[PDB]
Every structure is written in structure tokens, then in C-alpha cells.
Design an enzyme around this catalytic site. Structure first.
Site, PDB file in Angstrom:
ATOM      1  N   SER A  80       0.813  -1.206   0.000  1.00 51.51           N
ATOM      2  CA  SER A  80       0.000   0.000   0.000  1.00 51.51           C
ATOM      3  C   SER A  80       0.867   1.286   0.000  1.00 51.51           C
ATOM      4  O   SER A  80       1.715   1.462  -0.897  1.00 51.51           O
ATOM      5  CB  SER A  80      -0.890  -0.053   1.215  1.00 51.51           C
ATOM      6  OG  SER A  80      -2.095   0.554   0.923  1.00 51.51           O
ATOM      7  N   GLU A  90      -8.969  -5.426  -3.969  1.00 51.48           N
ATOM      8  CA  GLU A  90      -8.348  -4.211  -3.457  1.00 51.48           C
ATOM      9  C   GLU A  90      -9.314  -3.200  -2.848  1.00 51.48           C
ATOM     10  O   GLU A  90      -8.997  -2.563  -1.853  1.00 51.48           O
ATOM     11  CB  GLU A  90      -7.533  -3.527  -4.575  1.00 51.48           C
ATOM     12  CG  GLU A  90      -6.304  -4.336  -5.052  1.00 51.48           C
ATOM     13  CD  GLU A  90      -5.174  -4.343  -4.036  1.00 51.48           C
ATOM     14  OE1 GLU A  90      -5.274  -3.611  -3.025  1.00 51.48           O
ATOM     15  OE2 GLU A  90      -4.171  -5.069  -4.252  1.00 51.48           O
ATOM     16  N   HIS A 114      -7.525  -5.708   0.766  1.00 53.04           N
ATOM     17  CA  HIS A 114      -6.276  -4.950   0.770  1.00 53.04           C
ATOM     18  C   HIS A 114      -5.476  -5.307   2.023  1.00 53.04           C
ATOM     19  O   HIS A 114      -5.994  -5.219   3.127  1.00 53.04           O
ATOM     20  CB  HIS A 114      -6.631  -3.473   0.811  1.00 53.04           C
ATOM     21  CG  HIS A 114      -5.479  -2.552   0.599  1.00 53.04           C
ATOM     22  ND1 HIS A 114      -4.843  -2.423  -0.619  1.00 53.04           N
ATOM     23  CD2 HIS A 114      -4.920  -1.627   1.416  1.00 53.04           C
ATOM     24  CE1 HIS A 114      -3.953  -1.450  -0.550  1.00 53.04           C
ATOM     25  NE2 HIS A 114      -3.981  -0.950   0.674  1.00 53.04           N
TER      26      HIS A 114
END
Ligand SMILES: CC[N+](C)(CC)CCC[n+]1c(-c2ccccc2)c2cc(N)ccc2c2ccc(N)cc21
Ligand SMILES: *[C@@H]1O[C@H](CO[C@@H]2O[C@@H](C)[C@@H](O)[C@@H](O)[C@@H]2O)[C@@H](O)[C@H](O)[C@H]1NC(C)=O
Ligand SMILES: *[C@@H]1O[C@H](CO)[C@@H](O)[C@H](O)[C@H]1NC(C)=O
Ligand SMILES: *[C@@H]1O[C@H](CO)[C@@H](O)[C@H](O)[C@H]1NC(C)=O
Lengths: 534, 536
Positions: free
Chosen positions: A200, A325, A438
Site C-alpha cells: 500500500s 483491493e 487490501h
């Protein structure tokens, strides 16, 4: 006193601790300071190298977590708590950690340097999912992780000013990278083989080191998991950073840049965090207040421009995404979504979610998004609309920016490997509709399933071992394929011509072509053209 | 009379007719060809609405096809069956308002459902006398009464100075309407049932059928409708009053003419061939699938744009059959897109593709064209010649036919009509166009009319059985408003098309297969997004 736990670095002597990994002991040096505490007058300023210390510094415990907002959305829930600080918050947080095999490696071992994520407003190198004992014990890797300033402390900027130039959190990361060059050999690490990996915002950070010349001599390879330097959220213009900083100043009673910053420096840390979120320009998700700024210094131009014109000839890169995601982000602001029900939404809820998911989109752009993601055979089906909302957010923020980056790096000389992670942890506590969210590939890469007490299935443990091999093979050679195995299947390089990438799941590697090719063309080629004319 | 076949003498409102007994594979059929239904629209009548044919004395000979309406003749590929089959097969003349009737022999005992065919040809060509429109097979095998009329095309049928008295526009559509009135009044004389009239047409003929559905005065002249590869809505079937005025006066200039009265009067003095010779010089951009003189939104025959009318219309007591062929756009590519030819594989470059798109969607802005290119590009192989060639074909076919048909089916269904939809995917074994063109625009027609039943045409045995199936669907639809055979439950059913399920069937050698969504994603792009792009 164990001689294996005693090391000497440029600033002085350290004493680590022998830790227990499933297959044996590992040496851990935790909480090593790499910079002068960035406190008082040093708030918002670039980090300075840590002054030498006397005696033996105790490096057996994690240091404090950089001051940051703490999530309270779902109190007591593992799904959220696993990302919360697990040590005291403090601005005195510039410390790094080193895990190595026990006894320390006989010959120079390739080094992996982890950079955590957390939207540039949170995170810590001390979280359990970033535990480096597994990689150190099973692959004999030397793993390093550093804390870097987040939120206003790490990214509040008044561009051009002397006191708050911006990007100091990235500079914190860079100083830790310099510290590794200068001291990692003392631990048996090879400073000539340093691989950065992160997820990330941590992935976006890795990307920014790739695009900032002074960082380039500090590492040789890079892994960007679910994040990129380009894209809608990882950077802001100088103008927008100034705007958010002055607005934050105003919100806390402050007050010429010097005066403003001086006043910001007098405020208690929690006061800044209390107003952090009130500076975003629109109602949105996957958007963060204080992030890296295109300053014309650390970042000489926008990441977009730098990846289009850069020469990446002697660079190997591993990049990838998880299957869902965007699911995670929907419960943080999209009406109709919750982790506690199916989140089946209405079409009206969908059009509304899109304005929040693509906050910078005009009405025309938003309508194009809706028309592209609506399944015209079932335009009103709640399940489709819910999954489409998730896809919109993940594609816009991660998948397409990753496709974009992979393509430019490959076209311009780099060796690139790409993947899509599709295995949902048996122990996941988020609902099923969120899929593989995520951040949930991380526990596998770090090898947590190898800890019997964590209750992962036996297949998950074998899976984690496969992943650790890919990552460490990549760190060692710039290629994730096993040079021992002679019957894989092989993970081919990603290229603009063939666009090959692999699926990472319980089944053996499967080669696929085109990473959301049609949809990412929509995001990467058409939408821009739309807005730059309208 | 006295010595002639008593079964071929018939009387209609204008007088007595003598038809001809024709041979169909399974037996004889009665044909009445070249029946005049209007006063010749010549001299001072050019550009004017048709007037009903005045009664004649004696027995009018109706044994041969009459003149074809004056039109441009295609010479792109001299000697080639692929293009010749659509060319005029009788003398060209402005005196061309005649119609044809085919019926069983002897004529049906009880009132038989009537099928009225309206030919296509981009409103600038066509004729009811072409071999592919031969009604003897449907008449002989299904006992249908089939009627087909010639109607004015090109400038003669569509040049308009909107608001004027002398060239009001849409007179070709009025010629069609007059023939529909002629059927209402006289078809019973042939054993046809005026209370069961189904209109069917292809391409511009299909668009024509759709315009009769949208024009009130035509509504009382028929009960059911079939639109094959054509619609009244869409980018080519109509022009605005302003655009029509513009084209007509530019044409007038090109031929030495120039107040509307004077201009039209001067046009009426020009030789028919002079008008045809400049017909194509009035299109606003370089393009394909665009025709100079077409129906005009006059606020009279068409009270508003077809798009407005199908969005606000009430179609409760209407059954419609609509469909497309597998490759609507291929044919059009060889008529103007650089890189395409019927004589080679037409593999094109990406640059040729972008240029083809500007020609295929002539009204698209730069942004709209780029949207088309990005949507149709296969991003895994953006430079593949074969894919680009097929994508160019799909762009043209989707924009002009498939999506306008999906749009039409959707509105009609949502607003009361019973709709059946199909996609025709069989390529005639006798096709002379190259294979890359697939099943081109217009090549389902010979099957609907049953030509494969003629042994001398060399269709395969499977094609003959296939033709028979189609004739059954079309005539069942004409008879009941439902293409399904009421008895035979074995054969899979053809379900109605609905906005909810969007079901349609595949027409090919294999048994019916039901599919859902007619190019649903892509047509959403054309029907919902591109317009909105336009409003900005
Ligand atoms: C648009 C005006 N133009 C005069 C160019 C300045 C081109 C007209 C050429 N042009 C086109 C045509 C070719 C490519 C693209 C569009 C139309 C054309 C198209 C079809 N189906 C049939 C006949 C012709 C034709 C017949 C006679 C004359 N004299 C010109 C013609
Ligand atoms: C296909 O043909 C296109 C049109 O050219 C015409 O047809 C060819 C077969 C020749 O007979 C030529 O003299 C005609 O003018 C070409 O534009 C196109 O490049 C051709 N495709 C290829 C590359 O073979
Ligand atoms: C899920 O819960 C949220 C808040 O509790 C609510 O807004 C939403 O309507 C719920 N959705 C369902 C499936 O009822
Ligand atoms: C049909 O086939 C015969 C026999 O091969 C041939 O002589 C004739 O020309 C063909 N006619 C058609 C319709 O092509």
C-alpha cells in the site's frame, strides 16, 4: 552475555535478543535508533542522523510507534485492531529493527527492507504481521524494518519553506536505508544486495525511492504490493499540500510560513491528529490528508511524468495486487456498506458510492464510470452493484495504477514480474463479500502460517513457504523463480507485448495475460483524456 | 376473355387485371405483377406526394414486372454477383409506382394473412422485382398472399424543402403508404385478409416499416411488423429538416438551379440522370452507411424524431419481430474505408483503424472517436491486423444496426409491444463476398423468401430445410403475432424479448438457441454513454 546478540554499529554497541521461530532461533535487534528524535523544534523537519551513544544500547524490545490516528470504527474487532499501534505513541519514534538467522550468517546475506503501509497516516514496523523471524529463520534472510513519521508529523508541508519542506517521512525512510548501507554488514547482511518491499502506502514509498535519485544508490531491487507512486492518492501537488497545511493550522488556532509553522510546533500531537481528517477537499474514501508532495526536490516532477521519462534499465521489480483491493474501503464511508451484513446495495446507492470512490470525477466522468461498471444484463442487481462498487475503488486506486506502472517500467528497461494474490486467509474476520481484501497477503509473505498456534490450515503453511521462496529468490537474484526446481511452472517477466502475470493461490502458478486490460485502458487512457478537455 | 385461364382474371378498384401462372418447386402460384397504384409521379409531379391511380378500361396486363424507380446503379465491381444481385433488373424510369401480388394457385378459399414487403437500398436504391424478393415460394409453400411495391428513392423520393408545398419530403414513404391503402381496399379480391397485414422489410425497408409504426395515418393499414437489420431511430434513417433543406439546395446548386417554388420548379426541369449524378456530392462528411436523401423529420409524417417517438409511444396492441445478421458492418467497409477490399483479407493497421473510425462514425467529435477506438481496441493485441479489421466491421455494424435495434426492442417492449428478437448467423454456401465479411448485411433475405427451395440455385440440402424453418417462423408470426409453431412442442420455444431478460434467438443450421443481452455492454456504450458525451 551471548556473543551472537552483541553487535557494534557506527553509533555504538547493541544487544539483541534470541527469539524462537518454529524451526529454530533467530537474532533480533529491535528499537535501534537511526535518527535524532524529531521532537520540539524538529517537528516537520528532515531527520538528522542519530548521535553516537555510550555503553551497550538495549535492542531487545520494539520502540514507540510514530504518533498517529488510531482506528476506532470497530472496537475489539481483530480485522481493524491488527493494524492499530501495538506500542506507545510518541513523536520520538525513529527506530528500526533487524532480524537475522541465529547464529549470524557466515557470508553476506541478501537484505530485505520492509516499509509498512497505512495511508501515510498510520502504521508501525512492530505489528505482528511484519514479524521478520520466519523469513530470517526459514530463508536465512536479513530483514530490516523502520518506523517513519506519518500524518502531519511526516507529511505536512508548506512547499518552499525551510521549516516544513514536506516529504520528511520519506526522508526518514531514506535515512534508515543509509543506515543499512553503513551498518548492515555488521549483522551479516550484504549492503550490495538490498531489496525494498512494502505494501500500500509502503509500496508507494518504495516507488518513490525508485523515482528519487538520491535513494537509488541505497537499494538494488524493489517489490510494490498493492501500491504505486503514481495514481490518485499517493501524492498531492505543492499547491494542494499548502492549502491543507494552512487549513489545518487554522483549525488549531494558528497563527509568513515561519510564524505558522512555529505555532504548529507548539501544539500537542493529539491536537494535530484531531483535525487531520478535516482537510480533505471532498467526501471520499481511499484519500489521505498528508501524503508525499511533488516538491520539485525529493520528487523532481509528478510520479506520472517520472515513470514516463525514466530509464529503468538496471532495475528488477516485483509488483502485484490482491483479488479485492477495494472492498475494505467501502465500509469507511460509502452509504449502504457494513462489515456486519451482505451490503447489498441499490442502484442509487451505487451512483452515490461512485462520487465518493472517485471524488475527483466530474459528473460526466462519474457517469462514464457507472456505465462502464454497470452489468447491463442485471443493472439493478444488488450483488452486482455491491461488487462493482468494490471493483471501481480497487481499479481506480490500485489495479490500474499498478498496470500503468508495470507497463512503463517494462517499456523502459526494467525487468518486471507481476502477480494477483487470490487466496482468502482461513482466519479472516472480515465478511465473505469482501473477498481477499487490501493487506491480507502480507501475513503469508512474512510466513505467519508457519506458527502452529495461529491456526492456519496445513495448505496455507505450504503456500506461505512458496511465497517466502518467491520473495527471497527475487531478493537474491532479481528473479522469483526457483533456480533449483526444474519443473515449476515458470513465472514469466511482465512485458508490454504479452502482459503476463501469475495467480498466487493454493493451486500451482497459472500464467494469465492482461491485468484488467480493457478496464484499465478505460482508467489510464480514456478518463484522463476526458478530464483534460471535458 | 374466353380462351384464357379463368383463374388468372381479377378485378380491383381501378379495373380488370390478368395475372400469370408461375411455377414454384412444389406447384403453381398466381402472380399479378406491375399493378399501378399511383398516377406516374412524372413532370410536374416530381417531388410531390403520390396521387391514387385513375381507373383504366379493359384488362390491364399484370404478367411482368414494371419499371424500377430511377436510381444510382452500382458499378464498383462490374460483373460481380455480390453487387449485381441488388442492381435494377428492369428499365429505370420515374414512372415506377407499381406493386406485385403473389398468391396460391388456385387463389385461397378463405381470407389469408397478407405479408407486405418493403425493400431496402439505403433509400437511394432497390426494386420489388429483384430475384431475392421473389414471393412464389412463400405463396406456394405457406399459402401466403405476398405484396411488394416499388417506392421512389433518392432525390425523387426524398429530396425535400421542408415547409414548401412542392417538395414536402418523405414522398417515398407516402408511396409506400398508398400501396398499403391499395392493399386494404383490394387484397380481398385475391383472397387476402385485409384484417391481417404484416409489414416486413430489410435495412432501409426495415427503417421504413418502423416509420409506419410511428406515423399514425399508417397505423390503421397494418397489424404486425418485422424489421430486419434496420430501424427508424439510429444515425442514418432520418435527417433534420434543416439538414434536408441544406442538402436539397446544395444539390440544386450543383445542377444549375438558383424562394422554394422557383428552385423546385428548376429541379423539375432537370433530366433524372443529372440528379442521380450529383446525389452523392451533398453528404456533409466523408462516410459510409450514410445516404443523401432519406426520410425527413417534417413534423407531419414524422411528428418528432424517431427517438422521441419510440420513447413516448404507446405500443400496446403491436407485435414486432426484429433482428440482425452476424456481420452488419462488413459490406460497408469496402465502399470507402482505406485498406478494405473484397479481393484480399483486408488486414489493416492501427492507423487505418483510427481513420476508418472517423469515416464509420462521421458525426463523432475527436473525443467520441477516441472513446470508440478505446472501447473496440483489444488491449491484449492492440496492433493485430485481423482483430482491427473485425473491430472496424463491428464498429460500423453496432453503430448503425445492432445497437439501434437493441434500443428499439427495448423501448417497444417497455412500452407495451410484444417483441421477438433474433440474430441470423448462417453464411449462404453460395455467397460470393470473401469469407472475412462473414454473414453480411442483406444475406438472410434469400432464406426468408425461400430461394434455397429452388433446386437450380445450388443451396445445400440443410439450407433448404433451414429456409423452410424461417418461412414457417415468419408466416406463423404473420398469422398469429407469434413465430412459434402452435403444435410442435418438441422444437425449443422462441421467447419474447423483454427489458428484464433481454432474450433473443440464434437463427442458423442448428436448432434455436436462446441468448440474453443483445451486445448489452457495447450497446450501452452507444445508446447511453456516447449521447451523453455529446451533451458536452
Ligand atoms: C462526400 C462528397 N465527395 C464528393 C467528396 C468531397 C465524395 C462522394 C464520392 N462517392 C461515394 C462515396 C465514397 C466514399 C465515401 C462516401 C461516398 C459513393 C458511395 C456509394 N455507396 C455509391 C456511390 C458513390 C459515388 C457515386 C458517384 C459520385 N460522383 C461519387 C460517389
Ligand atoms: C487490399 O486491397 C486494398 C485496395 O487495393 C485494391 O485491391 C488490391 C487487391 C489491388 O488489386 C489494388 O490494385 C487495388 O487498388 C489495399 O489498399 C490494401 O493494402 C490491400 N491489403 C493488402 C495489404 O494486401
Ligand atoms: C447494513 O448495515 C448498515 C448499517 O448498519 C445499513 O446502512 C445497511 O442498510 C445494511 N444493509 C443491509 C443488507 O440491510
Ligand atoms: C449450379 O450448379 C450447376 C452444376 O454444377 C452449374 O452448372 C450451375 O452454373 C450452377 N448455378 C448456380 C446457381 O450457381
Amino acid at each position: 552475555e551471548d556473543p551472537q546478540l552483541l553487535v557494534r554499529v557506527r553509533g555504538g554497541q547493541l544487544r539483541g535478543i534470541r527469539l524462537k521461530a518454529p524451526g529454530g532461533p533467530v537474532s533480533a535487534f529491535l528499537g535501534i535508533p537511526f535518527a535524532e528524535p524529531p521532537v520540539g523544534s524538529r517537528r516537520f523537519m528532515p531527520p538528522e542522523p542519530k548521535r553516537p551513544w555510550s555503553g551497550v544500547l538495549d535492542a531487545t524490545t520494539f520502540q514507540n510507534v510514530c504518533y498517529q490516528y488510531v482506528d476506532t470504527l470497530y472496537p475489539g474487532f481483530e480485522g481493524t485492531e491488527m493494524w492499530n499501534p501495538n506500542r506507545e505513541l510518541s513523536e520520538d519514534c525513529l527506530y528500526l529493527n533487524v532480524w537475522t538467522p541465529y547464529p549470524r550468517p557466515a557470508s553476506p546475506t541478501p537484505v530485505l527492507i520492509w516499509i509498512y503501509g497505512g495511508g501515510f497516516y498510520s502504521g508501525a514496523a512492530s505489528l505482528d504481521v511484519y514479524d521478520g523471524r520466519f523469513l530470517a529463520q526459514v530463508e536465512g534472510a536479513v530483514l530490516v524494518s523502520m518506523n517513519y513519521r506519518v500524518g502531519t508529523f511526516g507529511f505536512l508541508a508548506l512547499p518552499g519553506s525551510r521549516e516544513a519542506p514536506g516529504n520528511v517521512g520519506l526522508l526518514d525512510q531514506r535515512l534508515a536505508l543509509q543506515w543499512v548501507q553503513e551498518n548492515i554488514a555488521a549483522f551479516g547482511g550484504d549492503p550490495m544486495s538490498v531489496t525494498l518491499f512494502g505494501e500500500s502506502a509502503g509500496a508507494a514509498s518504495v516507488g518513490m525511492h525508485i523515482l528519487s535519485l538520491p535513494s537509488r544508490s541505497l537499494f538494488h531491487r524493489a517489490v510494490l504490493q498493492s501500491g504505486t507512486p503514481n495514481g490518485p492518492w499517493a501524492t498531492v501537488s505543492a499547491g494542494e499540500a499548502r492549502r491543507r497545511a494552512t487549513l489545518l493550522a487554522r483549525l488549531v488556532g494558528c497563527p509568513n510560513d515561519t510564524e505558522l509553522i512555529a505555532c504548529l510546533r507548539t501544539r500537542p500531537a493529539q491536537d494535530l491528529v484531531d483535525h487531520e481528517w478535516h482537510v480533505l477537499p471532498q467526501e471520499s474514501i481511499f484519500r489521505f490528508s498528508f501524503v508525499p508532495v511533488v516538491d520539485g526536490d525529493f520528487l523532481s516532477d509528478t510520479p506520472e511524468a517520472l515513470i514516463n521519462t525514466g530509464d529503468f534499465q538496471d532495475l528488477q521489480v516485483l509488483v502485484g495486487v490482491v483479488k479485492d483491493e477495494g472492498s475494505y474501503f467501502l465500509v469507511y464511508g460509502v452509504p449502504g456498506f457494513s462489515k456486519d451484513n451482505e451490503s447489498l446495495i441499490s442502484r442509487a446507492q451505487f451512483l452515490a458510492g461512485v462520487r465518493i470512490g472517485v471524488p475527483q470525477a466530474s459528473d460526466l466522468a462519474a457517469e462514464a464510470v457507472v456505465l462502464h461498471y454497470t452489468d447491463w444484463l442485471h443493472p439493478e442487481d444488488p450483488t452486482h452493484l455491491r461488487d462493482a462498487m468494490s471493483a471501481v475503488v480497487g481499479d481506480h486506486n490500485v489495479v490500474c495504477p499498478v498496470a500503468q506502472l508495470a507497463g512503463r517500467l517494462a517499456a523502459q528497461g526494467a525487468r518486471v514480474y507481476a502477480y494477483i494474490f487470490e487466496h482468502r486467509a482461513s482466519t479472516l474476520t472480515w465478511p465473505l463479500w469482501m473477498g481477499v481484501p487490501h493487506g491480507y497477503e502480507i501475513e503469508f509473505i512474512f510466513g505467519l502460517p508457519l506458527d502452529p498456534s495461529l491456526n492456519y490450515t496445513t495448505e496455507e503453511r505450504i503456500f506461505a513457504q512458496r511465497l517466502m521462496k518467491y520473495w527471497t529468490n527475487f531478493a537474491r537474484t532479481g528473479d522469483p523463480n526457483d533456480p533449483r526446481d526444474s519443473k515449476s511452472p515458470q513465472w514469466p517477466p511482465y512485458t508490454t507485448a504479452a502482459q503476463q502475470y501469475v495467480s498466487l493461490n493454493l493451486k500451482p502458478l497459472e500464467v494469465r495475460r492482461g491485468l484488467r486490460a480493457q478496464t484499465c485502458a478505460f482508467w489510464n487512457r480514456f478518463l484522463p483524456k476526458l478530464l483534460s478537455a471535458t
